[PDB]
Structure 1
Amino acid sequence: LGLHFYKHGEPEEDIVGLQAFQERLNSYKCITDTLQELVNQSKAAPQSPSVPKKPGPPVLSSDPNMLSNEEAGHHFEQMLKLSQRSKDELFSIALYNWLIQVDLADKLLQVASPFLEPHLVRMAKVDQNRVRYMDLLWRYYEKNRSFSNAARVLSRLADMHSTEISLQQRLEYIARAILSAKSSTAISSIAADGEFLHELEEKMEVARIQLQIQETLQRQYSHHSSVQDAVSQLDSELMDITKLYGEFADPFKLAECKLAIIHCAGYSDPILVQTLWQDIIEKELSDSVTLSSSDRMHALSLKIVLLGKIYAGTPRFFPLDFIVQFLEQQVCTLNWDVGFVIQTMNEIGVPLPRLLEVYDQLFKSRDPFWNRMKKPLHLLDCIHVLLIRYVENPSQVLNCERRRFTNLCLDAVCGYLVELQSMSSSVAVQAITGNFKSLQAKLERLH
């Protein structure tokens, strides 16, 4: 009757099923409170020996009936591994509730019992702490390898309720939903678990922008009152980009966040996108001024390699040709390595033939900048490093395209050697004419 009562609904009319449910629980209590005694004994701090208030041998000032932390832990594990032999489903439910109430969560996730999934699938509709049971349920589905169900419960911590310990927990749930959906689609290529996967990876960057705001209120404004209001609002949901701009990043004037917010949400492309990539480059150039050129190269590489691995999939948001010209105009100004912009674009994963089409057209522009900066050869040194990097790792071009590309590289190297041999024959023009003929004399073997 106490298990019938539970299975139909715990209803207020069934006073007899309620009494049977209570008298089963009263009987189970001698198990729970003995497991509580052994867990309180094994969780206890070991007593620092009180300085003997008379000289002598050490007195063992403990009752010989007492257990140590190791005995209390052994007898707890042995009594738990007696309780785990029961048939009783309502006792299993009482033991599940007790394992949650003592924070023994991975030991709940050690009970291979068919009653555990139905129990979490009750509690995640009925307890006000609904969140903790969806958490235990996705952890249960992952540990039992039902990754498609785990993903569809981690959704139901973004899309349906949470409470958590900070916004950084939402970023575990989203990253682990992404891991569960990538595990699902690698197991069975159902479009919906790969369609929801883009929605999760968009939610991930909005949640990163939400965290960049939330921590920046803590890092800049934390002596004002309504930072507590705003940080706890930024903790309690996953916000859209309208809130994150209009309610948070504009009133706190966070230009650093305004910039990141408008880097994504459906906006007008070339002119505005190009400004945001200048602002992102010139901020990470500004705020790195305390470091050496090697460290500032590495910091700007990490920025543009991170953001490029998002937006290079969507070339409205990644204006490659402008980003290459601006980074090379900065390298040309700052006196950084000629390999730098070539490394950054290779480590994004930009297709090396399309990367050559950019430096090729930037050279053919004959831009007055390289002349103004007294480096009128610079883009030929870039093209040399790019083409030597291709020649001594030919895997950077696809095994069908490579024979189209070794023509285009010889055709272009012949063009640059006609250009160079029209220039005034300085030691740099002589050396680069040598470098391009050394490159030719390798490309002539790559075909």
Structure 2
Amino acid sequence: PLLYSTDDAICSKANELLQRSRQVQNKTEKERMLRESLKEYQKISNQVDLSNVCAQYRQVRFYEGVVELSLTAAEKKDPQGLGLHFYKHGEPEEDIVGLQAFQERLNSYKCITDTLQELVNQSKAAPQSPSVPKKPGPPVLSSDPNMLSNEEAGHHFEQMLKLSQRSKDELFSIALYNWLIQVDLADKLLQVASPFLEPHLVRMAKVDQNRVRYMDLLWRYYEKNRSFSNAARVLSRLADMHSTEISLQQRLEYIARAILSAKSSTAISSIAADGEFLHELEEKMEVARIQLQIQETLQRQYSHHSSVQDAVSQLDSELMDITKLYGEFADPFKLAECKLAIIHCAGYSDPILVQTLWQDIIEKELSDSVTLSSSDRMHALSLKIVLLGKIYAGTPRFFPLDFIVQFLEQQVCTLNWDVGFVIQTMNEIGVPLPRLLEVYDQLFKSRDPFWNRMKKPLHLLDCIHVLLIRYVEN
């Protein structure tokens, strides 16, 4: 009906590919004339609709058409920098207007993957010599030159890669890679190190939801540099600030970083930002290990089989906001050792508080031991106390003898054992020996109930005398 299209976006390319098959081979005939025709006689083709025309373009290996026509496309898509702030502005689509020009960009992305698969693959014969109906897309492999110039695809690779490495702008680099680099067998983005890789990586990291998909890549690819001894440089970026909560991986990181932890080493310039932060991380590491020990006990309890009804009233509200929450509050199993452990881990200074925690701990261990003790209640007590005194480096004001001693004398009173052995438990916990003398002299005055029955003066003085002369702190 007189219909006539002066400029054609795809018909020209379709016809030209028909001629490429029948008249002009891209690699061996009229390559420069084909480029020039591509720009000036196929300038109208510029933007090509992913269609049958593109399917017949796939069988030939030419790609200078892809890159330059895409340039003219970004010309006919972004007239004056529309693309630059498209990503650069960042997630405004939440409306009918935002998801508008994504069309044919997502199509070029999915299509690129389709092209990657079909172009990389082989013909019917190459995967299977005999040929049944042929899938459109795979390159045919027949009557290839005697010389091993048959494998054009290899330099096709080299060419397209140069295209990636070399461009006036970033248009065919960053823009057409969305559904190609996040699919199998893509090595261009990793090999290239553009000065814009890092900013896109930080932008992806900013959103936790976006970050998780790229998280393993996010740490490495984000940093061009080895980042040899980065500690909390990705940790600030790391989401949920999850240092002491899960403890099924936090300790894995703690050990795999602490068998290299270098404190006072001057590895990183900002002590306040890295040294101070990693110091807090070390405190948190103690927190996580201790809380994890709480978890392991409560989880493998036989007396407490399932843990369905108690743990979630604690976990759902705060999983691990603060250590003392679970250390002093969130332990239905009634652990008190955790309470004083977090009073040392999280410093609190009440003689009455510290003292009561001591009594609560002693009563907890004796009660558990009667229910279950390896040998002698005192021996189980020794197990627990060395465990506590090893994880916690002793603080001189935070480990007063006066507090422990009354309960130790209570234990000697209740459970009769060799006098040298209670001395061995306290001695092996590292308890101050000067304060041992001072406490055992203050306490002796007035014959306090704890020191009654005079079990030690029997042979303790002489045993400790000989023990000391041969050896210290014994």
Q: TM-score, normalised by structure 2?
A: 0.48
CA positional deviation for 1:122: 1.5
CA RMSD, Structure 1 to Structure 2 (Å):
9.4
Answer whether contact 1:42 1:68 (CA < 8 A) is retained. no
Q: Quick check: 72-81 or 4-13, which moved more?
A: 72-81
1:320 matches 2:320: no
Structure 2: runs of 5+ lacking an equivalent: 1-81
CA positional deviation for 1:383: 3.4
Structure 1 residues 67-100: Cα deviation after superposition (integer angstroms, max 9, x where no partner): 9999999999999999999999899989998899
| 3-state SS of 1:17 partner | coil
Answer whether contact 1:32 1:98 (CA < 8 A) is retained. yes
Answer whether contact 1:166 1:235 (CA < 8 A) is retained. no
| 3-state SS of 2:97 partner | helix
Answer whether contact 1:138 1:151 (CA < 8 A) is retained. no
CA positional deviation for 1:3: 7.3
| 3-state SS of 2:234 partner | helix
Of structures 1 and 2, the one scoring higher in RCO (CA 8 A, sep 6+) is 2
Distance 1:202 1:187, change over 3 A: closer
Answer whether contact 1:273 1:319 (CA < 8 A) is retained. no
Query: Higher helix fraction: Structure 1 or Structure 2?
Result: 1
Q: What is the distance in 1 between the residues matched to 2:153 and 2:216? A: 29
Q: What is the distance in 2 between the residues matched to 1:302 and 1:376? A: 26
Distance 1:61 1:157, change over 3 A: same
| 3-state SS of 1:288 partner | helix
Structure 1 residues 105-161: Cα deviation after superposition (integer angstroms, max 9, x where no partner): 999999998766544422222353546666765577999664775324435557657
Distance 1:307 1:40, change over 3 A: farther
CA positional deviation for 1:234: 1.8
Distance 1:168 1:11, change over 3 A: closer
| 3-state SS of 2:144 partner | coil
Q: What is the distance in 2 between the residues matched to 1:50 and 1:371? A: 101
Answer whether contact 2:299 2:307 (CA < 8 A) is retained. no
Q: Quick check: 373-382 or 88-97, which moved more?
A: 88-97
| 3-state SS of 2:370 partner | coil
2:346 to 265, 268, 271: 265
CA positional deviation for 1:222: 12
CA positional deviation for 1:294: 5.4
Distance 1:254 1:163, change over 3 A: closer
Q: What is the distance in 1 between the residues matched to 2:121 and 2:188? A: 16
Q: What is the distance in 2 between the residues matched to 1:160 and 1:152? A: 13
Q: What is the distance in 1 between the residues matched to 2:170 and 2:326? A: 51
Q: What is the distance in 2 between the residues matched to 1:69 and 1:245? A: 70
Distance 1:158 1:190, change over 3 A: same
CA positional deviation for 1:172: 4.6
Which entry has the higher C-alpha Rg, 1 or 2? 2
CA positional deviation for 1:244: 2.8
Q: Quick check: 271-280 or 348-357, which moved more?
A: 348-357
Distance 1:283 1:62, change over 3 A: farther
Q: What is the distance in 1 between the residues matched to 2:128 and 2:303? A: 41
Structure 1 residues 228-269: Cα deviation after superposition (integer angstroms, max 9, x where no partner): 695386268554559937996388866676666666656452
Q: What is the distance in 1 between the residues matched to 2:246 and 2:344? A: 28
Structure 1 residues 355-393: Cα deviation after superposition (integer angstroms, max 9, x where no partner): 665567667887675661644235425634762564xxx
Aligned residues: 392
Q: What is the distance in 2 between the residues matched to 1:350 and 1:321? A: 11
Distance 1:64 1:88, change over 3 A: same
Distance 1:330 1:163, change over 3 A: closer
Distance 1:114 1:19, change over 3 A: farther
Distance 1:265 1:102, change over 3 A: farther
Q: Percent identity?
A: 99
